[PDB]
Amino acid sequence: FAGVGERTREGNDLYREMIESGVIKLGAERGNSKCTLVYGQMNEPPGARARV
Amino acid sequence: LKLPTAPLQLSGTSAQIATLLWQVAAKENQLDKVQDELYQFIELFKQHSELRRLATDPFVPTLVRTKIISSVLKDSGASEITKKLFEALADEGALSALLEVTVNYEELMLAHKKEVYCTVITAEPLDKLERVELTKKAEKFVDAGFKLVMQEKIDKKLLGGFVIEFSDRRVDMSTAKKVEEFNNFVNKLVLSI
Amino acid sequence: DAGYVSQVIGPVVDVRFDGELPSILSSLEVEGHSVRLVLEVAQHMGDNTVRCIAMDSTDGLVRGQKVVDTGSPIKVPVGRGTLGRIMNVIGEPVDEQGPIDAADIWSIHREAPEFTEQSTEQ
Amino acid sequence: PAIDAGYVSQVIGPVVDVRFD
Amino acid sequence: KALDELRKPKFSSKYLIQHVSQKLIPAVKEWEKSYQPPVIHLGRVLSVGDGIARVYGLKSVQAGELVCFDSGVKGMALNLQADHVGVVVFGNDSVIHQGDLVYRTGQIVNVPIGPGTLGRVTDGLGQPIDGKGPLTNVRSSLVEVKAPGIIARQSVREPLFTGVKAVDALVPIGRGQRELIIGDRQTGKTAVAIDAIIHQKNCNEQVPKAQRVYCVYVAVGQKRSTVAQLVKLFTQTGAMRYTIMVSATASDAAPLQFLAPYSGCAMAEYFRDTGKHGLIIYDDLSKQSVAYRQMSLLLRRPPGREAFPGDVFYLHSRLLERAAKLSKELGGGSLTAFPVIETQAGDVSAYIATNVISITDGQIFLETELFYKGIRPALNVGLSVSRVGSAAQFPGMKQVAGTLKLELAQYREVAAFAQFGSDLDAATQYVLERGARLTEMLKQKQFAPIPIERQTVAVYAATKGFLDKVRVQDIVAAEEAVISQVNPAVFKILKANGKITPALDAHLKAELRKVKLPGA
Amino acid sequence: ADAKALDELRKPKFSSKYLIQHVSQKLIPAVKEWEKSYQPPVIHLGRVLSVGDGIARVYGLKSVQAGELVCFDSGVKGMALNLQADHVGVVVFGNDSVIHQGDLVYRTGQIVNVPIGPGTLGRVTDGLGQPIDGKGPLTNVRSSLVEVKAPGIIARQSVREPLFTGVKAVDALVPIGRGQRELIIGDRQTGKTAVAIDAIIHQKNCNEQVPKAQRVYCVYVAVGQKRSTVAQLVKLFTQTGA
Ligand SMILES: Nc1ncnc2c1ncn2[C@@H]1O[C@H](COP(=O)(O)OP(=O)(O)OP(=O)(O)O)[C@@H](O)[C@H]1O
Ligand SMILES: Nc1ncnc2c1ncn2[C@@H]1O[C@H](COP(=O)(O)OP(=O)(O)OP(=O)(O)O)[C@@H](O)[C@H]1O
C-alpha cells in the first residue's frame, strides 16, 4: 500500500483495520504479514509526497 | 565611512563599481594611476587568450580564477585598489565587466579633470586664424568653467563651415546644411505665394 | 567532495558542489540538520550547482551547511523485512517497531521494463 | 545643501525615482 | 575583433557592488583598523518595500528564522537567496531604511502557549492586545511543528457536540476531525462556529476536567470591530475562560495574517499534547491564503492558478494535519479543526476551496439561496458530507438520523414537482409535507445552542409525527412547546444513559401526548 | 556606456607599460600550474553547460544545424532545437540522468533520420526508428529526413479513389478518399482506436484482392499510450496477419 498524499487519519484507520483483521501481524509473528504500508500523507512537504 | 562625492552620477551595476573605484582612488589620490592600470588591463585582455578565457569561459572554476588573478597581480608595483578590485571581480566572474567599468571611470575622471571633449569636422585643413576664431564661438556652447578640447576631422561633403560634435549635442554651422535649409525655406513659399 | 547549500527557497534547495557534481535524481544528505533531511537532485543549475527538492521541511537550513553526496538515488530497505512495517519516503520505519530487516536495498528510481517483456494475457 | 537634496533618477509615468547621496 | 567577447557583461549576481564594496573600502590605507561591517551574524537592509526587506549578510541565518530589525520590528527570514536574504516584515515597513542593521535571533518563530493563554486576545505573533498585561502562565513553543504521525493517532470516537440542530443530526462532528464550513458572504459560517464555541460553555460545566473542550478562535483578515464585538459576546456569555482569541485583523501586516492560524494551532496544540480536548476555528482561511499570496508575490515567486503559489495546498495541509485524536500512549488528547472558506457566488471549483475541501473530512456547505428561504442555518443537506459518519454520532441521534437523511433525500427530489397545485399524488404529498416539517424543525436562532439531548427529543418528536398535526408555519414555536412541556426527567436521563433506551421510548412517546400544540 | 564610448578602447591607450610587460611572462606558468583543474576548450565541439527536465543547454557547438541530431558522450542522442547567442539548447532522447554538467556533446551532421523502406514493413520501432520488437537490426532499409517538405499544388491531383474502411457508418456517411486527411475526434473511451484498427484490418483484407498497385500499407503511430496497449495491438495485428 503506497498511500500517496491522503489524510493521516485514514492511514491510521487502515493500519488499525489491518492490525485487527490479521493482515499486519506485530511482534514475533511479523513474518506472516502480507502487506507493506508506505505512507506519504498530507503532512509532508511535496518532495516526499512526490516520491512515496 | 567618509567617501568623497563623485562629480557626475551614473547608471547601475557596472557604473556603480566605477563610482566606488573613483571614490576610493580619490580618497587615495591615485586617480590617474588606476586609469592607466585599467587601460593596461584592457590591452592585456586584448593581447593573450588565456586571460580572456578567464572571462568568457563558463567552465573555469572560481578557485583557479581567484588564485590566478591573485598570483599574477602579486607584483609589478600594482596599486592596492586595482589588486583588490580584480580580486573581487574575479571571485564573482565579473572580469568581463572591466570593459564597461573603465568607460564609466573615464567619464567620471573627465568630469573631474574638468575637461570636456568636442570634435569639429570640416572640409579643408584649418589654418591658425580659423582655429583661434573657432575656439571663441565653440566655447559659448559649454556651460561653466571647463577645458573644452577641440579635435579635428576632415570630410569633403561639407562645402565649408564647421560642425561641432560634443558627443551629446551637435552644432551644424556648416554651409552644406545652410544651403540645405535654404532650399527648404524657398519651396515652402513657392507652394504658398 | 562535499558541497554546501547555496540557496533555500521553499522546499527547493540549491546545493553548490565544487568539483564532481552528483547525477540527476541522486540522493543528498544534509549534515547538521536536526531531523534527518534528504535532498533529491532535480536538475543541474549550471555553475557547479544542483537544484534539489527536499523530502523534509527546510525550516532550519543555513547557507553553507555541508551536504554530502550518496552517489545514487533514494535507497529504501526492501524485501520480506518490510511486511507489516510502515515505511517512510526515504525508507525509514515510522511504525515505531524498530529498524527494518533488509533483504536488499534498492534505489527507488528505475526504468519502465521493455516492450518485449510484457504480458498480453487478459 | 549637497546632502539632503536628491535628484530625479528616472520617471515611468506617475512613478518617479529620486537618487540621493 | 578580439575585444567583442568581453563587450557585454555576464553577471552571475545582482548585488555585485555590495560584494565589491566589502573589498575595495579596505584598500584605503586609513581604513584597515576595524573599518568593516560584519555580516557573519548581522545583516544590512538592501531594499525595503511593500513589507518586504532584502537583507545582505546573515550568513548563519536559518530558513524561517525570526530576525529582528534595529528599528524594533521583527521579521521572518523566508527566502535565503544565494547573495541576500528575503526577509518579510511583521509590522509597518515605514520604520525601515536602506542601511539598517538586521540582528538575527537564532530562533524559529515562537508563540507563548500554556494555560495562561485562556482569555487572552493575542496576535498571530503572541502579543496580547486586550490590555490585561503580558502572558503570565505560559511557555514559548514553536509555530511550525511536525504533525503527528500514523502511530500517534487513534480512531475518532467521542463526539464534539455543536448545539446546532442542522449539523448535530446530519453532519456529525467527532472530537478530532477537521470540519470545513464553506459558504458565501453573510451565509452563517462564523455564526455556526460561534454556536460551536458557546455550546462548549454550556457543556463544560457538566463534564469532568478530562472531557472539557477549550476553544481557540483564529480571526484572520476580519475587522477589528468584528473581533471587538466577538470578545464582547464571549464575555457576555462568559465563554472567554475557555476561548483564546488569536486575531491578525485586516490592519495588521500580511505575514501576521499568514502566521495567525499557525500561531493559533500552536496555542491550541498545548491542550492536545496534555490530554485535554481542543477546538480550533481558523476563521476566514481564504484570507490567510490571500495574505500568503501577497507575501509570496512580493517575494518574486512564480505564481500559478489565480496567481497563488504552488505550495498553497501545502500551506493548508501542514496547518490542518495538526488536528487529530491522539492515542492513549500520547495522552488521548484531541484537536478539532474548523476551517472557514468563503466562496464567491458559489464557485466551489476555485483553487483554495477545492484544496481545503480535498483536505478536510467533513464539509458544511451553507448556501445563500436557502439562507433567504428562512432556513437559518443555511445548511445544504445534500452536499454536506461527514466522513466519520456514524462512528462518532451521538447514540439516540443515530436512531433517527438515518430516517432524517432518507426523508430529506426524498424531499430533495420531490422538488420541481410542487409548483403544480392541483397535481396531488397523496404519497409524494406526504413526503413533501414531511420534508417541510423536518426542514422547519432544524431552524435555530443564532447565539442559542441547544443541548444534544433536547435536540434528540425534538427531532424524535418530528420524525415520528408528533408534530405532524400542526401546519407548516407554526413549527418554530411548537418545537419550544415540545421542549418545555415534557418532563425535565427525560433530558436528565437521556444525557446520562447515552442512548434512547427501550425503558425510555415508551415514556416520552406518551409525554408527547400530554403536549399542547398551537394547531390542529 | 554606449557603443561609441566602447569602440574607442580597441585602440591602445595605456601610455605606460609597467603592468603588461611583467605579467605577460608570469601568466603562462600561472595557467600551467592549474592545468589539472581545467577542461579542454570546445569550439566545434559541445560541452553541457546545464541540464534539467530532459533539456540540456550545451555550450559550444559552433556548426550545428538547427534540428541536427547531436549525440552526447553518454550515448544518448539529442536534437538542437533552439540555437542561442552563446549556448545551444538541445533536447534529450531518453534518460536525462546520464547527462551531467560538464559532459561532451558531439554533433553528428545529420538532420534527424529514420530508416524507411520495404524492410521496416512489419516492425515495431520507437520514435527515432530503432526497432523495439527485437528481432535484429533493420535490413533492406535506408535513412531519410523526418521533416521533409510537403508536396505542393502541382504535385497533387484530385482525391477520387475511395478508401474503404470496413466500418459501415464510415463508408456510408463520411466516406474516406485515398488522399484525405480525416480526423477521428471524440472523448476518451469512445472507440477512436476502434475505427482506426478496423480500418487497418480492412486494408489488410483488401490488400489480398487488388493487383499490386492498389495495395495500401498502413502505418500506426502510438504516441503516449501504454507499452501494454502497444503490445496488445502487436498481438492483435499478428494474430490477424496485418
Ligand atoms: N440561526 C440564525 N438565525 C438567524 N439569523 C442568523 C442565524 N445564524 C446567522 N444569522 C445571521 O446571518 C449572518 C451571518 O453572518 P456571518 O457571521 O456568517 O458572516 P460571515 O459570512 O462569516 O462573513 P462576512 O461577514 O464576510 O459575510 C449574521 O448577521 C446573523 O445575524
Ligand atoms: N463498434 C464497437 N462495438 C463494440 N464495442 C466497441 C466498438 N468500438 C469500440 N468498442 C469497445 O469500446 C472500448 C473502447 O474502445 P477504444 O479503446 O477504441 O476507445 P478509445 O477512444 O481508444 O479510448 P482511449 O483513447 O482512452 O484508449 C473497447 O473495449 C472496445 O472493445
Ligand SMILES: [Mg+2]
Ligand atoms: Mg464572518
Ligand SMILES: [Mg+2]
Ligand atoms: Mg485510444
